[PDB]
Every structure is written in C-alpha cells, then in structure tokens.
Write an enzyme that holds these catalytic residues in place. Structure first.
Site: not given
Ligand SMILES: N[C@@H](COS(=O)(=O)O)C(=O)O
Ligand SMILES: [Ca+2]
Ligand SMILES: [Cl-]
Ligand SMILES: [Zn+2]
Ligand SMILES: [Zn+2]
Ligand SMILES: *[C@@H]1O[C@H](CO)[C@@H](O[C@@H]2O[C@H](CO)[C@@H](O[C@@H]3O[C@H](CO)[C@@H](O)[C@H](O[C@H]4O[C@H](CO)[C@@H](O)[C@H](O)[C@@H]4O)[C@@H]3O)[C@H](O)[C@H]2NC(C)=O)[C@H](O)[C@H]1NC(C)=O
Ligand SMILES: *[C@@H]1O[C@H](CO)[C@@H](O[C@@H]2O[C@H](CO)[C@@H](O[C@@H]3O[C@H](CO)[C@@H](O)[C@H](O[C@H]4O[C@H](CO)[C@@H](O)[C@H](O)[C@@H]4O)[C@@H]3O)[C@H](O)[C@H]2NC(C)=O)[C@H](O)[C@H]1NC(C)=O
Ligand SMILES: *[C@@H]1O[C@H](CO)[C@@H](O[C@@H]2O[C@H](CO)[C@@H](O)[C@H](O)[C@H]2NC(C)=O)[C@H](O)[C@H]1NC(C)=O
Ligand SMILES: *[C@@H]1O[C@H](CO)[C@@H](O[C@@H]2O[C@H](CO)[C@@H](O)[C@H](O)[C@H]2NC(C)=O)[C@H](O)[C@H]1NC(C)=O
Ligand SMILES: *[C@@H]1O[C@H](CO)[C@@H](O[C@@H]2O[C@H](CO)[C@@H](O)[C@H](O)[C@H]2NC(C)=O)[C@H](O)[C@H]1NC(C)=O
Ligand SMILES: *[C@@H]1O[C@H](CO)[C@@H](O[C@@H]2O[C@H](CO)[C@@H](O)[C@H](O)[C@H]2NC(C)=O)[C@H](O)[C@H]1NC(C)=O
Ligand SMILES: *[C@@H]1O[C@H](CO)[C@@H](O[C@@H]2O[C@H](CO)[C@@H](O)[C@H](O)[C@H]2NC(C)=O)[C@H](O)[C@H]1NC(C)=O
Ligand SMILES: *[C@@H]1O[C@H](CO)[C@@H](O[C@@H]2O[C@H](CO)[C@@H](O)[C@H](O)[C@H]2NC(C)=O)[C@H](O)[C@H]1NC(C)=O
Ligand SMILES: *[C@@H]1O[C@H](CO)[C@@H](O)[C@H](O)[C@H]1NC(C)=O
Ligand SMILES: *[C@@H]1O[C@H](CO)[C@@H](O)[C@H](O)[C@H]1NC(C)=O
Ligand SMILES: *[C@@H]1O[C@H](CO)[C@@H](O)[C@H](O)[C@H]1NC(C)=O
Ligand SMILES: *[C@@H]1O[C@H](CO)[C@@H](O)[C@H](O)[C@H]1NC(C)=O
Ligand SMILES: *[C@@H]1O[C@H](CO)[C@@H](O)[C@H](O)[C@H]1NC(C)=O
Ligand SMILES: *[C@@H]1O[C@H](CO)[C@@H](O)[C@H](O)[C@H]1NC(C)=O
Ligand SMILES: N[C@@H](COS(=O)(=O)O)C(=O)O
Ligand SMILES: [Ca+2]
Ligand SMILES: [Cl-]
Ligand SMILES: [Zn+2]
Ligand SMILES: [Zn+2]
Lengths: 694, 694
Positions: B218, B371, B463, B480-481, B610, B633
């Site tokens: 949420y 971050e 991720s 992403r690129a 769709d 996924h």
């Molecule tokens: N981009 C980040 C935060 O990513 S994560 O930890 O939230 O996956 C990093 O790698 O520190």
């Molecule tokens: Ca939340």
């Molecule tokens: Cl990116």
């Molecule tokens: Zn970043």
């Molecule tokens: Zn970062």
C-alpha cells in the site's frame, strides 16, 4: 428486428418444462458416468442450437463418496456396546423411483472416516453465537463431545468448523420441522414439505474460495502437482453425518443435562431440546456412535463451455453460468436453472441463425461438481484467469430458477442495480393479482427495500454458488436472480426438500410451477440481463449506485466500531480516511456519469466501457483478505460465520468481531486501523480508475 | 513532419551537458530540503517544456541517516580497550568542494545501531558460494565473528543477508583495488579510478520488492498504517559499515588463521588475504570494534510525475522513469540519466508546441529515494497499481546514462528485442572507428550475442533499479539502455567511483564523455524507444522473441535438473509439461504474428494491441513466488543470490538450488515438480492470451 424483445419472445415455458423433465429422470452426481453422458448431450444440443463452438473442459478434482458396501450410520449404543437404535441407510425413495439405481444415500461430502462414540451436546444451529451462548454463558464444554446441530441459518461447513474449534469429536446434522416443514402443507409426495425420513445432503468443506482442495491457485489439469491429503484445503477433521427428523427425534428424546437457554433453541419436535451433555439418568450410560466410511477420491469432472462470438467486441465476455451436477435428481437444484439456461441458449441461437450476433462474446457454462465446493467453475476460472481478468464484463449465475413462487430474489453488484430495475419494469409479472403489472411492481410490492420507497430489495453477494470465483476472487461484475418464497428468517435455510431424493421433476410440475411461468420469468430476467450486458453500446453499469452503497457500508461499519468509544479514544481509531475516500468516489463517479452521458467516437466509448468494466476489478486487493487469499474483493466477502451471506468491508468487520474478547486490545485495535487504511485506499483507488485517464 | 527523426534531431548533447551541470552542484540526498528544491525545479521546467500536467506525488517512507553529532567508525582495539586504529569519518572531498556542506559521510543505509567487537573473518565477496567454501570446505565458523567482505559481483544486501545467516555479528564492506582500480589509470581527480580514501555508500536492505519497509502492499500516504519497526520488511539485524581500501589494508594486514583457499580470494592489496578468524599471534588479543549510530526515520519524499496526453489512446501509458535522489552529487548516478530524461521531455515538448501529440499517453517520472530501496517508484506504483495494470504498455528506465564509454548495454523484456534492434540500426554510432556506422553495428561488434551471429547481447531484468515494481510485480514490458565499459566480470561491481563523493560533474565532463555524445546516443535510444512505444499504430512487441527465449530457458533449467539423474528417476521429475507449453506458445505466437500482419479496423487492432500489451502481464502469478509475494513474474525474478542479476524460471531454479543438501529429498523434489507445474501452466496460459479471443 433483432432486439431484446425478439430474444425474449422466443423463450417458451413449454421448452423449459421439457428440458427440466429431460434433465431429471436419472441422478447426475458429479464424477459419475451419467453426468458425463448429460454433459455430452448438453454439448451436442448447444451445437445444434447454433453456438459457434462448444467444448468440454475437464479437470481431476478431489470428490467424496460413501462406501457402497460399507454404509454410513449412527447408533445409540447401550453399555454392553449393543446398537439399540440405528439411523436409516437411505431415504425412502419417492413413488415411481423406488427402482432407480445409483441414488447416493445421504452423506456429508468430505467427512473423514471414523467411529467416534460419546455423549451428545445439542448446539442449536451451531452458529458462532450459539457456541458463545453454550461455552461463555452456560459454561458447557463441547470438548470430546458429539455435537448434534440443526440445519438452517448458516452454511453447514461453518457449523462443522465451529464444532471442530469447540473441540467436538463428531457432528450430526438433522433437519428440524421448525425450519423444514411449513405449517399446513403436506410432506412429499402430496405436498412440498420434508418427510421425517428426508435428509439434506451437502459438502461440509471450508474452502474459502480455493476450489479443488488439492490444487489451490492452479487448474487441476493433466500435469497438475497435487497437495498430499494432509495439506489439502478445507477438509473437516471430525466425522459428520446428516439425518432426518424421525432419526433425530430418537437421538434427542433421551437428552439430559442443562435445559435449552431459551425458546430460540427449541425446534418443533416433541422433545425437551436439552443441551445435555449426555442422556437423562435412566439412559445415562447409553452413548451415540457414528460409523463413517466415505472416501475422498480424485475424480474427473466436465464443464460444458459454449461460445457465441461477438460481432463488434469479440474480446469482451458476458458469461451465463450454472451447474449441471446434482445430489440425486436435481428437480430444483440445479436442473430448474440449467433448463432455463438451455432455453436461453436456444433463443440466442435462433437469432444467430437469422444472422444476428451479439455485440460482445457470450459464454455459456454448464459447470460440474458445484455440490462439492464450486469445483468446476473455480478450476475453469483458475485456468482462464488472465482472459477473464482482462476481458470479463459480467457473470450471471444460473443455479435453481425457483425456490418458492412468491417473488423475485436478486443478489448482484451495485453496478447492475439500474440494469435490473430497468429490465424488470419491462417484464410482465407472472404473479396472481398483478396481471398486466410489471415484474418491477410485484417484486417491489412483495419485497420492499429496507432503505428506499418504491424500490425492491437487492442483496449482497457472498458465496455458496458458482459466481464466487468470478466476483470474490477475480472482481468481475456478477449477478443472480430467482423466484423465492415469503418465509423471512428461512433465507439461508433452503426450501424443505433441498438436497433430498424428493427434489424431483414432479415436485416442480405439481407444487412449484405447473405452468412454468415463474421459470419463464426467471429466464427473461437472466437472459435479458445477459442480452443487455452483451449488446448495449455503453455497458449498462451505473457507478453512482456503488457510491450510494459505499456510504451506507461505511456508516454501518463505523456504527459497529462506535460500540467501543473508549477504545476508539485510546487507540485513536478514525474512520475519517474511509469517509473521505467514499466522498471522493461519489464526486468522481458523478463526473464520470456526466462524461458518459456527454461524448461517434469508439475509442472514448471503449475507453469509457473499459473504465466501467474495470471498476469492479478495482475493488480487488491482490494480497487478498487476512488468511483468505482467494477472497480478494475489499467491499464484499462471504461472511466468515456464514459463507452464504455477503458481508460488506469484511476486513474491518472481522477485525472488529468479538474484539472485546481479544487478549491484546492494542494489537486488535491496531489491526482495525490497518483494515480501515486498506479499505480507504482501495475505495480511493477504485474512484481514480473513473477519473480522466490523462 | 513530426516523426521520430524530428524528435531525435531536436535532442542536443549541449543541453544534456547544461542539465547535468545544473543537477550536480549540490548534494540531493533523498529526504533532504535540497532534493525537495530540485523536485520543484524539475516540476517547473517540465511545465515550461510543454507537458499537459506536472505534479509532485509525495510519500512518508522509512529512510536512514548517520548521526551528525555521533559519527560511525570502526577501530582496531587493543587488549586494554585502547582504540589504536580508527577508520575515516569522511572521504577527502574533491578539489573545489572541500567547502560543500551536507555531504553525507559514508554509511550503510538501514544498519542497526551497535558497537560489536570480535575477531575478523574475511569472506571474499560474501557470495552464497564463498560461504559454502568457508563453512563446508574450510570448516570455518562465522558465528559471533565480524565479517569483512569486499564489494563486487553481487548486490551488497545479499552479502549482509548471507553474513547474517552464517551467524556474523557485524559486517564491514570495503572496495578492493582488484575490483575498483583499473590498471594504468589515475585516481580521482586526475583520472576515473577510486582513491584509497574513496568509499561506496548504499543501502543493505533485502526488500524483495516490498518498497517502504513499513507499508508493504500500500502507498505510504497520509493515513497509512505502518508496521512497527520490529515487523518492518528487509532490515538487517547486525551493524554494517563501508570503508575505503586504505582503511581496509589496515584491518586486513594483521589477519591470521587459515590462508586464502585460492587466488580468486586474493584482491590486489599487499596483504595475505588470510580468512582468519582473528589476527596473527603477536596481535592475537587485538579485536575489531564497530561504532554504528545511524537512525531510521520516516521522512517525506517527492516524485515528479509529468503527463503528455495521447491524441488517440490517452488511456494507454508509456512511462519513462528514473531517479533524482543521489548519495552525494550524483554526477553519474543518477544525474547523467536525469539530464537525458530532461532533454527527452524538452524535445517531446518542442513537437507538442508545434501541435503534435503522441498517439498514446507518455508519463515522465523523476523518482525519489531510489537509493534507499526503490521507494519512490514502488510507493507510486502501489498507489496507482490498478491504472498501471490495465493501462501500462511499457516502462523505460533512465538511471545513469553512462557507466563507461565502450559500448551500449541493454536489459529488456524479449518483447522489445526487435524494437531495439531496429531502432539501433537507424542510429549513428558515436564510437571511434565507427563513424558513418550504425549503433547496431558497433554494439553488435563490441558486445556479441553468445547464441547468435551478427546479433548483440541483450540481458535479462532482475532488480537494483526503478523498473523493478513495473516488471517484477506488475508485469509491464520494461527495458533499459546505457553506455557501459568493457570490463567483463566487473558487471554487477559498478564503475570505480560508484556511490562515492568523487562522482561529480567533472568526473563526467573530463574522463567519461567530454563531448556528451554517449549521453546523446543514450537519449536517442531511450527517447526513441519511448517515441515508438507511444506512437506506433501496432505496439512494437514481437511475441515470437519470447517464444525463442522460453525454449532457451527451459533447456537451461532442464540441464540444471539433469545433474541429478537418479533423483529424477526416483521422484519421476518430468519437464515434459514445460517443453509442451513452450511448443504451444511458439505455435500460437507464430499464428498471432500472421494475423497481426494480415488485418482499417481499429477494434481488431486495439484488440490485437491489448493482446500484445497483456502478454507480459500474463506471466504474472498473483500468488507470487515462494516467500516473495512482490516478485510475481514466473519467467524472470531478481536472483535470490544477487538482486542485480535477472534469473529465468526462478521458482524452479531456487527449488533446484543446493538440492543435494536438503534433508528430505522427497519433499525437495516434490517442490521442484510443483514449480515445473506452475511454470508450464503459466507459459500455456500466456500463450492462450494470444489465441483468437472467441
Ligand atoms: N540502485 C540501488 C538501490 O537499489 S536497491 O538496493 O534498492 O536494489 C543500489 O544498487 O544501491
Ligand atoms: Ca508501500
Ligand atoms: Cl537504467
Ligand atoms: Zn541510481
Ligand atoms: Zn545509486
Ligand atoms: C479525497 O480527495 C482529496 C483530493 O481533493 C484528497 O485530498 C488530499 O488530502 C491529502 C491528505 O490530507 C493532502 O495532503 C497534504 O498535502 C500537502 C501538500 O499538498 C502537505 O503539505 C500536507 O502535509 C502536511 O500536513 C499534514 C496534516 O496536518 C501533516 O501530517 C504533514 O506532516 C505535513 O505538515 C498533506 O500531506 C493533499 O494535499 C490533498 N490533495 C488535494 C486537496 O488536492 C484526499 O486525500 C482524498 N481522500 C483519500 C482517502 O484519498
Ligand atoms: C499444448 O497444447 C495441446 C493442444 O494441442 C494440449 O494437448 C492436450 O493435452 C492434454 C493432456 O495430454 C489432452 O488431455 C487428454 O484429453 C483426453 C480428452 O480430450 C482425455 O481422455 C485424456 O485423459 C486420458 O488419458 C490420460 C493420459 O494417458 C490419462 O491420464 C487419463 O486418466 C485418461 O485416461 C487426457 O486428459 C488433451 O486432449 C489435449 N488437447 C488437444 C490435443 O486438443 C497440451 O496439453 C498443451 N500443453 C500444455 C502444457 O498445456
Ligand atoms: C433428453 O433429450 C435428449 C436429446 O433429445 C435425448 O437424447 C437423444 O436420444 C435419442 C434416442 O435415444 C438419440 O437418437 C440421440 O442420440 C440423443 N441425442 C443427444 C444425446 O443429443 C435423451 O434421450 C433425453 N433423455 C431422457 C431421459 O429423456
Ligand atoms: C444396527 O446395526 C448393527 C450393525 O449392522 C447391528 O448389530 C449387528 O448385528 C449382527 C447380527 O445380529 C451382529 O452379528 C453384529 O455383530 C452386530 N454389529 C455391531 C454391533 O456392530 C444392530 O442389530 C442394529 N441395531 C438395531 C436396533 O437394529
Ligand atoms: C435505466 O433507465 C433510465 C431511464 O431511461 C436511464 O437513464 C436515462 O438515460 C438516458 C440515456 O443516457 C439519459 O438521457 C437520461 O437522462 C437518463 N435518465 C435518468 C437518469 O433518469 C438509465 O441510464 C438506465 N440504466 C441503465 C441502462 O443501466
Ligand atoms: C539550475 O537551473 C535552474 C532553472 O534555470 C535555476 O533555477 C532558476 O534560477 C533563477 C536564478 O535564481 C531563478 O530566477 C528561478 O526561480 C529558478 N528557476 C526554477 C527553479 O525553475 C537554478 O538556479 C540552477 N541551479 C544551479 C545550481 O545552477
Ligand atoms: C579513535 O577514536 C576514539 C574515540 O574518539 C579515540 O579514543 C578517545 O580518546 C579520547 C581523548 O584521548 C578519550 O578521552 C576517550 O575516552 C577515547 N574514546 C574511546 C576509547 O572510546 C582514539 O584516540 C582514536 N584512536 C586513534 C588511534 O586515533
Ligand atoms: C523491425 O523491422 C523489421 C524489418 O522491417 C520488421 O519486420 C517487417 O515488418 C513488416 C510490416 O509488418 C512486414 O511486412 C515484413 O515482412 C517484416 N519483415 C521481416 C519480419 O523481416 C519488424 O516488424 C520490425 N520490428 C518491430 C517494429 O518491432
Ligand atoms: C468399502 O468397505 C470396506 C472397508 O474396508 C472395503 O471392502 C473397501 O475397501 C471399501 N472401499 C473403499 C475404502 O473405497
Ligand atoms: C473442556 O473439557 C475437556 C475435558 O478433558 C478439557 O480438555 C478442556 O480443557 C475443557 N475446556 C475448558 C477450558 O473448559
Ligand atoms: C405456490 O403458490 C401458492 C399460493 O400462495 C402456495 O399455496 C403454494 O404453496 C406455492 N408453492 C410453493 C412450493 O411454495
Ligand atoms: C545523536 O547522538 C546522540 C546519541 O545518544 C544524541 O545526541 C542524539 O540523540 C543522537 N541523534 C539521534 C539518535 O537521532
Ligand atoms: C559456530 O561456532 C559457535 C560458537 O559458539 C556455535 O554457536 C555454532 O554452533 C558453531 N557452528 C557450527 C555447527 O560449526
Ligand atoms: C573513454 O574511452 C577511452 C578510449 O578507450 C579510454 O581510454 C577512457 O578510459 C574512457 N573513459 C572511461 C571512464 O572509461
Ligand atoms: N451450493 C452448494 C455448494 O456450495 S459450497 O458449499 O461449495 O459453498 C451448497 O450450498 O451445498
Ligand atoms: Ca485448482
Ligand atoms: Cl443462482
Ligand atoms: Zn445448486
Ligand atoms: Zn445444491
């Protein structure tokens, strides 16, 4: 012209009669060859009727059957272990059927095997509140006892769950003439009343939406991985058996201990209704002994899925679905619904032959194994959940068309309130003394809305039927409509012959609907709803009707909480966010309605139709409700005390339930507030699906 | 004309330079006033640039900061408890910034407070396999020890999780010149290498997709109910602090016990790389002591959400999103991405002023608190999950535009493989020695596909960035690129100055991209992808590319299982259903492509769009993956050993992982087979979304 009137006029009461006769000559128990034969017949006829395709979708699911060579029964056992009374091994078959084979004797589907013996405690309807009364007020202990409960009020699985958690070692269910014998009418075959030898079958699972106990989440297809029986969903852990009121008289007459706490605990039998435990002093060493030998077995079931492709929006699905499997002959339950569906299909196929197609796809379903836990519908929806999620406009259920002949009974989403009011104003009433009057007028007169003048009652959706997976798990707008009786407090009880061998074609033709005019009215309501959902250019949903009930449910939940004003102070329990979300939903809904009225542009239309279609969808929470992952609708869920009853804001309702009894009030009230947040958020989020999209 | 070439030509390297300079003069730490100021500036400029609306969406989320008056550090402590060595309290600030205030000193976001002391064990990269080697092979016990691990290879949160489950009482992370100092290049300010006083910040949470630790499921809005800190998602239970390689030299030089098991355990420092535990005999009574006083606090964050309404399909959303918050100046991470986004917005706004609108809505996002665990993106997607689910065509991420200047790096869904190949063939390479050549040619040459000749490598999505909630939880096609370096095995390591104070504008302008031509190339790739997704009449997804990788992933998972042929016999482990589902997906995909080629009908088109849009959606399982409910996924998930790495058939992969070590092989293999069923089903179900709809 091919319009709704053409659809409707083509329906005939005589055809529905003939289909009912045809579907009710032999038993059609889920999982048996005769029900597979009938599936194949329905499939063949729906092709003949004109559908574009008609397929069987089969699954292998957990079903339950008595042992043919080792019958279930209950005994009064004397002190030397002589069985001095035996309950019946079958119901006396009705006239003309005393030679039908394959009539399943009464049993509780999914009972484990066992031969427990002990002393009776009589638990009234075995409701949550009846166990409160017993244990809390009367200080009666059900631990190691055999509970005997009367059917009525609530779903039988809830009774067995409640008994199990009170520590019972066995449950005996019986039908009391107070609930299943209407004053002044005769027992079957000479009236519609339950005979003393009549017994209500039914499963006693607590599935909470799972479908097949062995495969929650996924279709029970050919390669499915199955849970072990010990991890199965919803199985009772104590033996259960149902009996008639002749047998029950025998079991209750000797009962001792404490008297009934009051008159709401007394049925109509000429017995004391002593709660017990055990028998009066003379028979105090007599015990009750159950003999349960039923087996659970993975068994193949068959849904019939017919498709009538839409001319303009083939990727939008209006579903008319109802079950085909029966306990025995299914004269009401379900063949009175299934015969109505068959004639609906015939009628739509008549127009289809003349070149018509509905605007949207219509899907027609003959579900299997409904009686064993909505298994057919659920497994099919699990298999097709992505298509249904993204394409499902609406689901109209089609179980029993009649359970009485007094008036119309509708349970649906608020999104169909207007559709239903409008359609019923266009239909003729079949009632005596309302000839020339609309169905709306007779229904509104006989079944008035508790809040509105000149409006009929429409009830909320819970579970106990095949709409459940579509509405509660998937969030597809759902509705149902049938004829029902007057009998108020007999609402979740059933009609007298419910799930008994006596539910026959003759029962219907002779005592319910000799002209098939109630059936025909029901076919017009169901088929007419489907026709409008499938063909109206703008989907016939009014989002403003949801805004209205949301405020009513918020007021209601808030009033429940406000029984605990001190705790609401101490824990800072505010409903402000929920009332705010409801206000926003109301305002945003109103603006959407203006735009819907105010736009030759098919993209705006479809965009707008998608908004209408996804609005029910918006009330789904993908985390589900607490410990009930298949109940995902935040506004409605089947009541945790009675799966047949819909509950509103079920997450907050259960967080508040019996809260004054919780040991950590801070933790319990913290959870109330968590649930308020979840509901306010979900209402706000559903409202925003109706905002301008960009 | 207003076509893609007009969009693309309007982008200028000079504008991206200016924006980068502008975004990198002060620190923009999540939750601080300066990042709120920059949000308001971005919002004002995106309005000036022409967007239809630009809003701030704010949330109150758990963030983490060092105590300003009580600094974190580590000590070598002698036997009388004298602290004889102290790690640094800050990184020596770069030339010209030695008077910037509000530079957050190095710390591990979300470390609990503590002052543990004990003996060091050196655990290499602290990978799953490095703990296997230690405990299994070397019989070294990390219980009650302080582990010191080098950064590199895997996400730092996995290291801290692995250390915690080995029973460590504290973790020290350092940057080894082997991983963060390229041979022959100079330390910052005179090159792009990491100085010995440089430190990599970063959070060490194991959120598994949850977003804000306090509000999983949420949005962390104004009325949100928050979990207590003790039930928070993903918090480490042991103190953690990161250091530079000067400080690490000091901590490792004295280390005793067992020698490094092999050369893959030795970094580049002039130390033995003894695993320990503890120091060599002379200093054997010396200990290591951490001092961690950081606090976790609920803090407000701000996303900027800009909307460019679509002319034809306003209820379809193409999202270009990247973060704005930085550890310090963000010269690469993220402002090199954010400056590219700003110029993309400017360009689309230029065409918009001349009367153009994209066909679909484009949404532009400046995410906050990336971050600290992808918090901004996640909370926004939690709030808007119903709109995104039903309307989200695609998400293009826009973190750091460059992490090197060698070649293009693309990670995306197979659904965008063709789009990317085609767009890159239309773009000029900015590389030396490929002038007049396409980006496709230079990228394919420098980064060849391991399976295909004359194709470039495109990687899988895991991720570690803001695309995560859109792809892994919601199933929206994502890509992403960026420009990247050559350095193979340094892939999940970072560039040397990653998350250090030294990541400045000058770093970029001087050593990465003085002409801003790599930035410009990246803006063309990101903006061009978005332009095509938003404007192409038929969505630019090729379902057949998914069919191809599904077979490759099935082969791969099957080969992993086939390392255990005896158990596959004993437990009857078949992959037949999965290969069958992949075959059906291939056949059905092929037929859909024919129809897509073979249909003036906007309903068929949109129906077909769709289908394309919902195909990524079809790979979502609403039950999620085991114990990871936000990773839904079925084909991809972030690796359970390294969240930065995508894994294919993650459910089967983890069921198979280290299986020979499980105590109940029957139970472990039963789970492998359950996961095979889930994957076969989901592949089959996704295939059927591409069948004719009725
Ligand atoms: N981009 C980040 C935060 O990513 S994560 O930890 O939230 O996956 C990093 O790698 O520190
Ligand atoms: Ca939340
Ligand atoms: Cl990116
Ligand atoms: Zn970043
Ligand atoms: Zn970062
Ligand atoms: C129903 O719809 C309305 C939209 O008309 C929506 O109103 C919104 O309510 C939120 C919650 O009150 C408002 O949030 C405020 O936003 C401002 C910035 O816009 C903040 O500065 C506020 O925070 C301060 O004040 C708080 C309360 O005293 C403090 O707790 C806090 O620490 C800050 O000091 C606050 O976040 C929001 O602005 C409006 N949006 C509008 C009017 O456009 C309402 O929330 C909807 N209801 C639901 C249940 O969603
Ligand atoms: C890929 O697509 C194909 C469709 O082309 C699909 O093929 C289907 O496979 C199932 C599973 O094999 C078939 O199921 C059979 O169905 C018949 C009735 O149609 C049943 O009689 C069969 O059951 C008997 O035989 C079984 C196996 O020996 C016994 O276990 C069982 O007890 C019965 O005796 C069986 O259920 C189905 O007919 C086809 N459908 C077709 C060809 O149209 C395939 O499953 C898809 N792959 C995946 C992973 O979905
Ligand atoms: C119910 O009606 C069906 C359909 O008319 C009857 O089934 C047909 O019976 C005739 C005579 O045996 C056969 O020629 C056909 O093969 C059957 N058609 C089908 C299955 O579509 C069926 O006999 C009727 N059942 C009862 C109990 O009257
Ligand atoms: C109730 O049923 C039981 C079981 O059929 C009857 O008891 C059995 O009677 C036979 C023949 O006399 C005995 O050989 C078995 O040992 C008995 N089975 C038992 C006790 O489990 C019993 O007669 C029946 N009771 C009544 C009143 O009819
Ligand atoms: C039920 O019927 C009412 C009365 O016809 C419908 O409401 C009218 O709809 C038309 C067409 O949009 C409007 O011009 C009128 O202003 C409406 N009258 C009202 C609100 O009193 C209503 O839309 C119908 N409900 C359906 C089809 O779901
Ligand atoms: C980054 O660029 C922005 C936008 O041009 C600059 O902000 C503007 O600064 C002038 C001078 O103070 C003001 O008149 C405006 O109010 C600002 N506009 C905004 C916020 O849209 C900003 O000063 C630049 N920052 C740096 C570090 O150079
Ligand atoms: C490392 O830092 C600690 C803490 O600042 C230093 O030890 C402190 O020194 C002051 C002044 O001499 C004492 O009054 C405190 O009692 C000490 N704090 C402790 C032991 O926690 C220590 O000098 C530093 N070590 C080095 C080598 O500089
Ligand atoms: C990438 O470009 C190829 C080559 O143009 C596109 O494939 C062509 O698409 C057209 C239009 O449908 C077809 O007539 C051709 O037969 C296709 N050529 C092929 C497959 O070699 C492809 O569609 C593009 N991919 C996109 C836009 O995602
Ligand atoms: C029916 O009764 C007995 C119980 O042992 C036996 O003949 C047979 O196995 C039973 N059938 C079952 C358990 O399916
Ligand atoms: C009910 O009675 C049984 C008798 O053994 C006992 O186990 C159980 O604790 C009792 N419940 C209470 C607390 O009254
Ligand atoms: C049908 O209606 C009549 C009239 O009230 C009633 O006497 C009869 O009992 C009804 N049938 C049933 C089953 O209720
Ligand atoms: C910072 O350091 C000390 C620790 O007690 C104290 O002055 C202050 O409370 C701390 N700030 C915090 C914990 O936010
Ligand atoms: C590791 O060492 C600690 C020392 O107390 C102990 O608690 C733990 O069980 C050990 N692990 C094993 C099994 O080697
Ligand atoms: C930019 O490219 C040149 C040429 O190979 C290289 O020497 C330089 O190190 C590159 N910049 C970075 C940061 O890699
Ligand atoms: N209609 C059924 C089966 O429903 S449920 O038990 O599966 O909810 C009955 O009430 O017995
Ligand atoms: Ca299932
Ligand atoms: Cl019904
Ligand atoms: Zn039924
Ligand atoms: Zn029934």
């Amino acid at each position: 012209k091919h319009n709704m009137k053409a659809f409707l006029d083509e329906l005939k009461a005589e055809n529905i009669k003939k289909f009912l006769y045809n579907f009710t000559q032999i038993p059609h128990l889920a999982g048996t060859e005769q029900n597979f034969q009938l599936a194949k017949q329905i499939q063949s006829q729906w092709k003949e009727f004109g559908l574009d395709s008609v397929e069987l979708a089969h699954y292998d699911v957990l079903l339950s059957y008595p042992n043919k060579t080792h019958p279930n029964y209950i005994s009064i056992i004397n002190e030397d272990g002589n069985e001095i009374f035996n309950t019946s091994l079958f119901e006396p078959p009705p006239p003309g059927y005393e030679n039908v084979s394959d009539i399943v004797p009464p049993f509780s589907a999914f009972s484990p095997q066992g031969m427990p013996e002990g002393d009776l405690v009589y638990v009234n309807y075995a409701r949550t509140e009846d166990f409160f009364k017993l244990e809390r007020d009367m200080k009666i202990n059900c631990s190691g006892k055999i509970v005997i409960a009367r059917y009525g009020k609530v779903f039988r699985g809830n009774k067995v769950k409640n008994a199990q958690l009170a520590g019972a070692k066995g449950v005996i269910l019986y039908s009391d003439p107070a609930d299943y014998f209407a004053p002044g009418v005769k027992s079957y075959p000479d009236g519609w009343n339950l005979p003393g030898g009549g017994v209500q079958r039914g499963n006693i699972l607590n599935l909470n939406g799972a479908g097949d106990p062995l495969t929650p989440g996924y279709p029970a297809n050919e390669y499915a991985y199955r849970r072990g029986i010990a991890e199965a969903v919803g199985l009772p852990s104590i033996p259960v058996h149902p009996i008639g009121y002749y047998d029950a008289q025998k079991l209750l007459e000797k009962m001792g201990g404490s008297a009934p706490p009051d008159s709401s605990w007394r049925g109509s039998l000429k017995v004391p209704y002593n709660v017990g435990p055990g028998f009066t002093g003379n028979f105090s060493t007599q015990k009750v002994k159950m003999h349960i030998h039923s087996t659970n077995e993975v068994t193949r079931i068959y849904n019939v899925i017919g498709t009538l492709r839409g001319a303009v929006e083939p990727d939008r699905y209006v579903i008319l679905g109802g079950h085909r499997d029966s306990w025995v002959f299914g004269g009401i339950d379900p063949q009175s619904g299934a015969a109505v569906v068959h004639e609906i299909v015939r009628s739509f196929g008549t127009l289809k032959k003349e070149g018509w197609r509905p605007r949207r796809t219509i899907l027609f379903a003959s579900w299997d194994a409904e009686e064993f836990g909505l298994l057919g519908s659920t497994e099919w929806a699990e298999e097709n959940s992505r298509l249904l999620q993204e394409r499902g406009v609406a689901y109209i259920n089609a179980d029993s068309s009649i359970e009485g002949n007094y008036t119309l009974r509708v349970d649906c989403t608020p999104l169909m309130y207007s559709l239903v009011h409008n359609l019923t104003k266009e239909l003729k009433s079949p009632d005596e003394g309302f000839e020339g009057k609309s169905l709306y007028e007779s229904w509104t007169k006989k079944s008035p809305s508790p809040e509105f003048s000149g409006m009929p009652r429409i009830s909320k959706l819970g579970s106990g039927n095949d709409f459940e997976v579509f509405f509660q798990r998937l969030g597809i707008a759902s509705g149902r409509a049938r004829y029902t009786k007057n009998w108020e407090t007999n609402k979740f009880s059933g009609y007298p012959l419910y799930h008994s061998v006596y539910e026959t074609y003759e029962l219907v033709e002779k005592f319910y609907d000799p002209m098939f005019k109630y059936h025909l009215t029901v076919a017009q309501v169901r088929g007419g709803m489907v026709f409008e959902l499938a063909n109206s250019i703008v989907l016939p949903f009014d989002c403003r009707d949801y805004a209205v009930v949301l405020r009513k449910y918020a007021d209601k939940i808030y009033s429940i909480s406000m029984k605990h004003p001190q705790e609401m102070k101490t824990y800072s329990v505010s409903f402000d966010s929920l009332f705010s979300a409801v206000k926003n939903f109301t305002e945003i809904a109103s603006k959407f309605s203006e735009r819907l009225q105010d736009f030759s542009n098919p993209i705006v239309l479809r965009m707008m139709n998608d908004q209408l279609m996804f609005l029910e969808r918006a009330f789904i929470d993908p985390l589900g409700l607490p410990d009930r992952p298949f109940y995902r609708h935040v506004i409605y869920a089947p009541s945790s005390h009675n799966k047949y009853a819909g509950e509103s804001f079920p997450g907050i309702y259960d967080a508040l339930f019996d809260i004054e009894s919780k040991v950590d009030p801070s933790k319990a009230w913290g959870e109330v507030k968590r649930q308020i947040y979840v509901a306010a958020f979900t209402v706000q989020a559903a409202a925003e699906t109706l905002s301008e999209v960009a």
